[PDB]
């Protein structure tokens, strides 16, 4: 199914990434997500809740991404986490009516905007 | 078990046009919405690309990404006019074995929060 395929992509993905469901559960976090963020033997949820400003930002972005903006690119830009600035894309995928939400973390300097 | 196969499955019925190109510039897969939005006459994606007059930046960015040895960049090519409307196109490279594949995803716009 979609979840298995997305997991396979993300686990071969060379930056931190994770998959969530509509309930806030972290379904899967890739190796680099663990190595970047989960270095206190802590759960992804505990990590998230410890990052006040980021949690507040990504919570709203994630709701916008999966409820409204399936055809818009949803980014949280230039957020400081774990001694670096990140930019995070948030995208939802449907399996039937089940939303599967992807967070992909990029170095903020590795995301470039440019007109046509 | 291919990265390419898994990625194809993810984007197949995803509600944005999206396509995958190989490192040489061949279209290797276009999703359903890509066909519906862009290939309405069953023309090749290759001919559709050649017809575009607003693709200078997209093409330049894609060439650079096609040869990258690291796969962590996201390039957003904003306000590309195709036919009669604007798209924002993201460009990402993925490792498939030892070669690169390039994913284009087509959005109505990018929404940035700080």
PDB file of C-alpha atoms in Angstrom:
ATOM      1  CA  UNK A   1       0.000   0.000   0.000  1.00  0.00           C
ATOM      2  CA  UNK A   2       0.876   3.717  -0.014  1.00  0.00           C
ATOM      3  CA  UNK A   3       2.339   3.633   3.502  1.00  0.00           C
ATOM      4  CA  UNK A   4       4.773   0.803   2.624  1.00  0.00           C
ATOM      5  CA  UNK A   5       5.855   2.576  -0.566  1.00  0.00           C
ATOM      6  CA  UNK A   6       6.298   5.942   1.144  1.00  0.00           C
ATOM      7  CA  UNK A   7       8.234   4.323   3.986  1.00  0.00           C
ATOM      8  CA  UNK A   8      10.556   2.644   1.455  1.00  0.00           C
ATOM      9  CA  UNK A   9      11.209   5.988  -0.239  1.00  0.00           C
ATOM     10  CA  UNK A  10      11.855   7.817   3.070  1.00  0.00           C
ATOM     11  CA  UNK A  11      14.121   5.143   4.464  1.00  0.00           C
ATOM     12  CA  UNK A  12      16.363   5.665   1.420  1.00  0.00           C
ATOM     13  CA  UNK A  13      16.055   9.407   1.867  1.00  0.00           C
ATOM     14  CA  UNK A  14      19.283  11.285   2.793  1.00  0.00           C
ATOM     15  CA  UNK A  15      17.823  13.801   5.167  1.00  0.00           C
ATOM     16  CA  UNK A  16      15.595  13.563   8.193  1.00  0.00           C
ATOM     17  CA  UNK A  17      12.007  12.660   7.391  1.00  0.00           C
ATOM     18  CA  UNK A  18       9.004  11.186   9.132  1.00  0.00           C
ATOM     19  CA  UNK A  19       5.471   9.994   8.432  1.00  0.00           C
ATOM     20  CA  UNK A  20       2.501  10.934  10.615  1.00  0.00           C
ATOM     21  CA  UNK A  21      -1.208  10.124  10.527  1.00  0.00           C
ATOM     22  CA  UNK A  22      -4.251  12.386  11.074  1.00  0.00           C
ATOM     23  CA  UNK A  23      -4.156  11.565  14.813  1.00  0.00           C
ATOM     24  CA  UNK A  24      -0.696  13.031  15.429  1.00  0.00           C
ATOM     25  CA  UNK A  25       0.997   9.638  15.660  1.00  0.00           C
ATOM     26  CA  UNK A  26       4.491   9.302  14.295  1.00  0.00           C
ATOM     27  CA  UNK A  27       4.128   6.175  12.126  1.00  0.00           C
ATOM     28  CA  UNK A  28       7.759   6.103  10.980  1.00  0.00           C
ATOM     29  CA  UNK A  29      10.907   8.201  11.421  1.00  0.00           C
ATOM     30  CA  UNK A  30      13.899   7.467   9.182  1.00  0.00           C
ATOM     31  CA  UNK A  31      17.475   6.858  10.350  1.00  0.00           C
ATOM     32  CA  UNK A  32      18.563  10.437   9.838  1.00  0.00           C
ATOM     33  CA  UNK A  33      15.581  11.748  11.808  1.00  0.00           C
ATOM     34  CA  UNK A  34      16.703   9.547  14.719  1.00  0.00           C
ATOM     35  CA  UNK A  35      20.334  10.609  14.429  1.00  0.00           C
ATOM     36  CA  UNK A  36      19.511  14.336  14.164  1.00  0.00           C
ATOM     37  CA  UNK A  37      16.716  14.645  16.711  1.00  0.00           C
ATOM     38  CA  UNK A  38      16.219  11.520  18.829  1.00  0.00           C
ATOM     39  CA  UNK A  39      19.624  11.365  20.572  1.00  0.00           C
ATOM     40  CA  UNK A  40      18.243  11.123  24.137  1.00  0.00           C
ATOM     41  CA  UNK A  41      16.560   7.746  23.559  1.00  0.00           C
ATOM     42  CA  UNK A  42      13.323   9.761  23.404  1.00  0.00           C
ATOM     43  CA  UNK A  43      10.186   9.219  21.339  1.00  0.00           C
ATOM     44  CA  UNK A  44       9.432  11.512  18.421  1.00  0.00           C
ATOM     45  CA  UNK A  45       6.360  12.819  20.265  1.00  0.00           C
ATOM     46  CA  UNK A  46       8.400  13.698  23.359  1.00  0.00           C
ATOM     47  CA  UNK A  47      10.947  15.432  21.152  1.00  0.00           C
ATOM     48  CA  UNK A  48       8.258  17.382  19.355  1.00  0.00           C
ATOM     49  CA  UNK A  49       6.608  18.536  22.567  1.00  0.00           C
ATOM     50  CA  UNK A  50      10.026  19.720  23.854  1.00  0.00           C
ATOM     51  CA  UNK A  51      10.391  22.066  20.865  1.00  0.00           C
ATOM     52  CA  UNK A  52       7.768  24.643  21.791  1.00  0.00           C
ATOM     53  CA  UNK A  53       8.097  27.102  18.915  1.00  0.00           C
ATOM     54  CA  UNK A  54       8.504  24.429  16.269  1.00  0.00           C
ATOM     55  CA  UNK A  55       5.624  22.331  17.577  1.00  0.00           C
ATOM     56  CA  UNK A  56       3.337  25.373  17.484  1.00  0.00           C
ATOM     57  CA  UNK A  57       4.409  26.155  13.888  1.00  0.00           C
ATOM     58  CA  UNK A  58       4.332  22.658  12.405  1.00  0.00           C
ATOM     59  CA  UNK A  59       1.023  21.819  14.136  1.00  0.00           C
ATOM     60  CA  UNK A  60      -0.753  24.593  12.198  1.00  0.00           C
ATOM     61  CA  UNK A  61       1.156  23.935   8.966  1.00  0.00           C
ATOM     62  CA  UNK A  62       0.313  20.267   9.121  1.00  0.00           C
ATOM     63  CA  UNK A  63      -3.397  21.019   9.611  1.00  0.00           C
ATOM     64  CA  UNK A  64      -3.304  23.441   6.650  1.00  0.00           C
ATOM     65  CA  UNK A  65      -1.429  20.919   4.511  1.00  0.00           C
ATOM     66  CA  UNK A  66      -3.708  17.939   4.865  1.00  0.00           C
ATOM     67  CA  UNK A  67      -7.097  19.634   5.382  1.00  0.00           C
ATOM     68  CA  UNK A  68      -6.848  22.431   2.794  1.00  0.00           C
ATOM     69  CA  UNK A  69      -3.740  22.697   0.734  1.00  0.00           C
ATOM     70  CA  UNK A  70      -3.119  19.304  -0.980  1.00  0.00           C
ATOM     71  CA  UNK A  71      -2.078  21.116  -4.174  1.00  0.00           C
ATOM     72  CA  UNK A  72      -0.032  23.825  -2.424  1.00  0.00           C
ATOM     73  CA  UNK A  73       3.548  23.370  -1.301  1.00  0.00           C
ATOM     74  CA  UNK A  74       3.582  23.813   2.459  1.00  0.00           C
ATOM     75  CA  UNK A  75       6.900  24.875   3.990  1.00  0.00           C
ATOM     76  CA  UNK A  76       8.068  25.821   7.454  1.00  0.00           C
ATOM     77  CA  UNK A  77      11.159  27.880   6.623  1.00  0.00           C
ATOM     78  CA  UNK A  78      14.346  28.712   8.552  1.00  0.00           C
ATOM     79  CA  UNK A  79      13.499  27.045  11.869  1.00  0.00           C
ATOM     80  CA  UNK A  80      16.275  26.508  14.403  1.00  0.00           C
ATOM     81  CA  UNK A  81      16.378  22.927  15.737  1.00  0.00           C
ATOM     82  CA  UNK A  82      19.389  21.039  17.183  1.00  0.00           C
ATOM     83  CA  UNK A  83      22.002  23.696  16.364  1.00  0.00           C
ATOM     84  CA  UNK A  84      20.987  24.166  12.704  1.00  0.00           C
ATOM     85  CA  UNK A  85      18.409  25.974  10.591  1.00  0.00           C
ATOM     86  CA  UNK A  86      15.973  23.732   8.750  1.00  0.00           C
ATOM     87  CA  UNK A  87      13.242  24.119   6.196  1.00  0.00           C
ATOM     88  CA  UNK A  88      10.501  21.481   6.370  1.00  0.00           C
ATOM     89  CA  UNK A  89       8.071  20.478   3.610  1.00  0.00           C
ATOM     90  CA  UNK A  90       4.763  18.996   4.713  1.00  0.00           C
ATOM     91  CA  UNK A  91       2.717  16.922   2.240  1.00  0.00           C
ATOM     92  CA  UNK A  92      -0.333  14.719   2.698  1.00  0.00           C
ATOM     93  CA  UNK A  93      -1.074  11.533   0.794  1.00  0.00           C
ATOM     94  CA  UNK A  94      -4.368   9.649   0.731  1.00  0.00           C
ATOM     95  CA  UNK A  95      -5.001   5.954   0.964  1.00  0.00           C
ATOM     96  CA  UNK A  96      -8.783   6.036   0.622  1.00  0.00           C
ATOM     97  CA  UNK A  97      -9.796   8.571   3.271  1.00  0.00           C
ATOM     98  CA  UNK A  98      -6.732   7.934   5.456  1.00  0.00           C
ATOM     99  CA  UNK A  99      -4.292  10.875   5.365  1.00  0.00           C
ATOM    100  CA  UNK A 100      -0.615   9.975   5.541  1.00  0.00           C
ATOM    101  CA  UNK A 101       1.464  13.082   6.229  1.00  0.00           C
ATOM    102  CA  UNK A 102       5.140  13.428   5.252  1.00  0.00           C
ATOM    103  CA  UNK A 103       7.611  15.846   6.867  1.00  0.00           C
ATOM    104  CA  UNK A 104      10.866  16.263   4.924  1.00  0.00           C
ATOM    105  CA  UNK A 105      13.678  18.245   6.573  1.00  0.00           C
ATOM    106  CA  UNK A 106      16.124  20.222   4.458  1.00  0.00           C
ATOM    107  CA  UNK A 107      19.048  22.414   5.505  1.00  0.00           C
ATOM    108  CA  UNK A 108      17.481  25.874   5.168  1.00  0.00           C
ATOM    109  CA  UNK A 109      20.344  26.906   2.821  1.00  0.00           C
ATOM    110  CA  UNK A 110      19.550  23.882   0.598  1.00  0.00           C
ATOM    111  CA  UNK A 111      16.059  25.167  -0.315  1.00  0.00           C
ATOM    112  CA  UNK A 112      16.207  27.678  -3.195  1.00  0.00           C
ATOM    113  CA  UNK A 113      13.394  29.835  -4.629  1.00  0.00           C
ATOM    114  CA  UNK A 114      13.597  31.278  -8.144  1.00  0.00           C
ATOM    115  CA  UNK A 115      11.212  32.800 -10.697  1.00  0.00           C
ATOM    116  CA  UNK A 116      10.819  31.140 -14.129  1.00  0.00           C
TER     117      UNK A 116
ATOM    118  CA  UNK B   1      11.963  -2.909  -4.287  1.00  0.00           C
ATOM    119  CA  UNK B   2      13.261  -0.208  -6.685  1.00  0.00           C
ATOM    120  CA  UNK B   3      13.419   3.292  -5.234  1.00  0.00           C
ATOM    121  CA  UNK B   4      12.007   4.230  -8.644  1.00  0.00           C
ATOM    122  CA  UNK B   5       9.157   1.697  -8.259  1.00  0.00           C
ATOM    123  CA  UNK B   6       8.261   2.853  -4.737  1.00  0.00           C
ATOM    124  CA  UNK B   7       8.365   6.536  -5.787  1.00  0.00           C
ATOM    125  CA  UNK B   8       6.223   5.824  -8.845  1.00  0.00           C
ATOM    126  CA  UNK B   9       3.612   4.166  -6.578  1.00  0.00           C
ATOM    127  CA  UNK B  10       3.568   7.145  -4.182  1.00  0.00           C
ATOM    128  CA  UNK B  11       2.979   9.757  -6.914  1.00  0.00           C
ATOM    129  CA  UNK B  12       0.719   7.736  -9.254  1.00  0.00           C
ATOM    130  CA  UNK B  13      -2.659   9.044  -7.999  1.00  0.00           C
ATOM    131  CA  UNK B  14      -1.367  11.948  -5.928  1.00  0.00           C
ATOM    132  CA  UNK B  15      -3.397  15.123  -6.583  1.00  0.00           C
ATOM    133  CA  UNK B  16      -0.598  17.193  -8.161  1.00  0.00           C
ATOM    134  CA  UNK B  17       0.901  16.594 -11.592  1.00  0.00           C
ATOM    135  CA  UNK B  18       4.286  14.921 -11.117  1.00  0.00           C
ATOM    136  CA  UNK B  19       6.859  13.215 -13.279  1.00  0.00           C
ATOM    137  CA  UNK B  20      10.189  11.462 -13.043  1.00  0.00           C
ATOM    138  CA  UNK B  21      13.066  11.947 -15.478  1.00  0.00           C
ATOM    139  CA  UNK B  22      16.306  10.032 -15.711  1.00  0.00           C
ATOM    140  CA  UNK B  23      19.758  11.598 -15.571  1.00  0.00           C
ATOM    141  CA  UNK B  24      19.865  11.931 -19.356  1.00  0.00           C
ATOM    142  CA  UNK B  25      16.594  13.907 -19.525  1.00  0.00           C
ATOM    143  CA  UNK B  26      14.228  11.148 -20.582  1.00  0.00           C
ATOM    144  CA  UNK B  27      10.757  11.104 -19.035  1.00  0.00           C
ATOM    145  CA  UNK B  28      10.473   7.708 -17.354  1.00  0.00           C
ATOM    146  CA  UNK B  29       7.096   8.166 -15.622  1.00  0.00           C
ATOM    147  CA  UNK B  30       4.298  10.764 -15.594  1.00  0.00           C
ATOM    148  CA  UNK B  31       1.434  10.416 -13.098  1.00  0.00           C
ATOM    149  CA  UNK B  32      -2.270  10.450 -13.876  1.00  0.00           C
ATOM    150  CA  UNK B  33      -2.748  14.157 -13.187  1.00  0.00           C
ATOM    151  CA  UNK B  34       0.288  14.983 -15.360  1.00  0.00           C
ATOM    152  CA  UNK B  35      -1.318  13.156 -18.285  1.00  0.00           C
ATOM    153  CA  UNK B  36      -4.670  14.874 -17.619  1.00  0.00           C
ATOM    154  CA  UNK B  37      -3.263  18.394 -17.162  1.00  0.00           C
ATOM    155  CA  UNK B  38      -0.565  18.347 -19.842  1.00  0.00           C
ATOM    156  CA  UNK B  39      -0.728  15.338 -22.227  1.00  0.00           C
ATOM    157  CA  UNK B  40      -4.357  15.651 -23.309  1.00  0.00           C
ATOM    158  CA  UNK B  41      -3.645  14.594 -26.937  1.00  0.00           C
ATOM    159  CA  UNK B  42      -1.549  11.537 -25.956  1.00  0.00           C
ATOM    160  CA  UNK B  43       1.539  13.440 -27.139  1.00  0.00           C
ATOM    161  CA  UNK B  44       4.833  12.491 -25.552  1.00  0.00           C
ATOM    162  CA  UNK B  45       5.972  14.391 -22.486  1.00  0.00           C
ATOM    163  CA  UNK B  46       9.138  15.041 -24.514  1.00  0.00           C
ATOM    164  CA  UNK B  47       7.244  17.051 -27.191  1.00  0.00           C
ATOM    165  CA  UNK B  48       5.274  18.929 -24.526  1.00  0.00           C
ATOM    166  CA  UNK B  49       8.535  19.979 -22.877  1.00  0.00           C
ATOM    167  CA  UNK B  50      10.029  21.169 -26.180  1.00  0.00           C
ATOM    168  CA  UNK B  51       7.023  23.440 -26.760  1.00  0.00           C
ATOM    169  CA  UNK B  52       7.391  25.339 -23.480  1.00  0.00           C
ATOM    170  CA  UNK B  53       8.648  28.909 -23.728  1.00  0.00           C
ATOM    171  CA  UNK B  54       8.785  29.538 -19.962  1.00  0.00           C
ATOM    172  CA  UNK B  55      11.128  26.634 -19.080  1.00  0.00           C
ATOM    173  CA  UNK B  56      14.576  28.322 -19.084  1.00  0.00           C
ATOM    174  CA  UNK B  57      14.988  28.250 -15.302  1.00  0.00           C
ATOM    175  CA  UNK B  58      13.340  24.839 -14.851  1.00  0.00           C
ATOM    176  CA  UNK B  59      15.697  23.330 -17.444  1.00  0.00           C
ATOM    177  CA  UNK B  60      18.798  25.028 -15.966  1.00  0.00           C
ATOM    178  CA  UNK B  61      17.949  23.893 -12.430  1.00  0.00           C
ATOM    179  CA  UNK B  62      17.203  20.368 -13.599  1.00  0.00           C
ATOM    180  CA  UNK B  63      20.545  20.020 -15.376  1.00  0.00           C
ATOM    181  CA  UNK B  64      22.394  21.041 -12.216  1.00  0.00           C
ATOM    182  CA  UNK B  65      20.373  18.575 -10.121  1.00  0.00           C
ATOM    183  CA  UNK B  66      20.753  15.737 -12.644  1.00  0.00           C
ATOM    184  CA  UNK B  67      24.505  15.583 -11.948  1.00  0.00           C
ATOM    185  CA  UNK B  68      24.547  16.311  -8.201  1.00  0.00           C
ATOM    186  CA  UNK B  69      26.312  13.784  -5.944  1.00  0.00           C
ATOM    187  CA  UNK B  70      24.228  14.757  -2.943  1.00  0.00           C
ATOM    188  CA  UNK B  71      20.426  14.474  -2.849  1.00  0.00           C
ATOM    189  CA  UNK B  72      19.375  16.942  -0.219  1.00  0.00           C
ATOM    190  CA  UNK B  73      18.471  20.088  -2.183  1.00  0.00           C
ATOM    191  CA  UNK B  74      14.996  21.363  -2.953  1.00  0.00           C
ATOM    192  CA  UNK B  75      14.651  23.877  -5.771  1.00  0.00           C
ATOM    193  CA  UNK B  76      11.368  25.706  -6.242  1.00  0.00           C
ATOM    194  CA  UNK B  77      10.821  27.222  -9.671  1.00  0.00           C
ATOM    195  CA  UNK B  78       8.032  29.685  -9.073  1.00  0.00           C
ATOM    196  CA  UNK B  79       5.355  31.083 -11.379  1.00  0.00           C
ATOM    197  CA  UNK B  80       6.065  29.011 -14.483  1.00  0.00           C
ATOM    198  CA  UNK B  81       3.383  29.762 -17.068  1.00  0.00           C
ATOM    199  CA  UNK B  82       2.164  26.664 -18.888  1.00  0.00           C
ATOM    200  CA  UNK B  83      -0.621  26.963 -21.516  1.00  0.00           C
ATOM    201  CA  UNK B  84      -2.741  29.487 -19.609  1.00  0.00           C
ATOM    202  CA  UNK B  85      -1.845  29.275 -15.923  1.00  0.00           C
ATOM    203  CA  UNK B  86       0.918  29.481 -13.396  1.00  0.00           C
ATOM    204  CA  UNK B  87       2.535  26.574 -11.551  1.00  0.00           C
ATOM    205  CA  UNK B  88       5.261  26.357  -8.955  1.00  0.00           C
ATOM    206  CA  UNK B  89       7.470  23.367  -9.721  1.00  0.00           C
ATOM    207  CA  UNK B  90       9.709  21.657  -7.181  1.00  0.00           C
ATOM    208  CA  UNK B  91      12.776  19.835  -8.393  1.00  0.00           C
ATOM    209  CA  UNK B  92      14.500  17.096  -6.353  1.00  0.00           C
ATOM    210  CA  UNK B  93      17.109  14.481  -7.190  1.00  0.00           C
ATOM    211  CA  UNK B  94      16.975  10.914  -5.821  1.00  0.00           C
ATOM    212  CA  UNK B  95      19.581   8.222  -5.946  1.00  0.00           C
ATOM    213  CA  UNK B  96      18.403   5.164  -7.877  1.00  0.00           C
ATOM    214  CA  UNK B  97      21.271   2.649  -7.552  1.00  0.00           C
ATOM    215  CA  UNK B  98      24.281   4.695  -8.773  1.00  0.00           C
ATOM    216  CA  UNK B  99      22.328   7.063 -11.015  1.00  0.00           C
ATOM    217  CA  UNK B 100      20.153  10.081 -10.352  1.00  0.00           C
ATOM    218  CA  UNK B 101      16.472  10.450 -11.109  1.00  0.00           C
ATOM    219  CA  UNK B 102      14.746  13.831 -11.025  1.00  0.00           C
ATOM    220  CA  UNK B 103      11.265  14.411  -9.598  1.00  0.00           C
ATOM    221  CA  UNK B 104       9.198  17.367 -10.727  1.00  0.00           C
ATOM    222  CA  UNK B 105       6.085  18.140  -8.710  1.00  0.00           C
ATOM    223  CA  UNK B 106       3.641  20.793  -9.903  1.00  0.00           C
ATOM    224  CA  UNK B 107       1.812  22.968  -7.382  1.00  0.00           C
ATOM    225  CA  UNK B 108      -0.609  25.863  -7.575  1.00  0.00           C
ATOM    226  CA  UNK B 109       1.759  27.818  -5.314  1.00  0.00           C
ATOM    227  CA  UNK B 110       4.186  27.522  -2.408  1.00  0.00           C
ATOM    228  CA  UNK B 111       2.895  28.596   1.013  1.00  0.00           C
ATOM    229  CA  UNK B 112       5.732  29.602   3.342  1.00  0.00           C
ATOM    230  CA  UNK B 113       5.422  30.093   7.117  1.00  0.00           C
ATOM    231  CA  UNK B 114       8.208  31.481   9.342  1.00  0.00           C
TER     232      UNK B 114
END
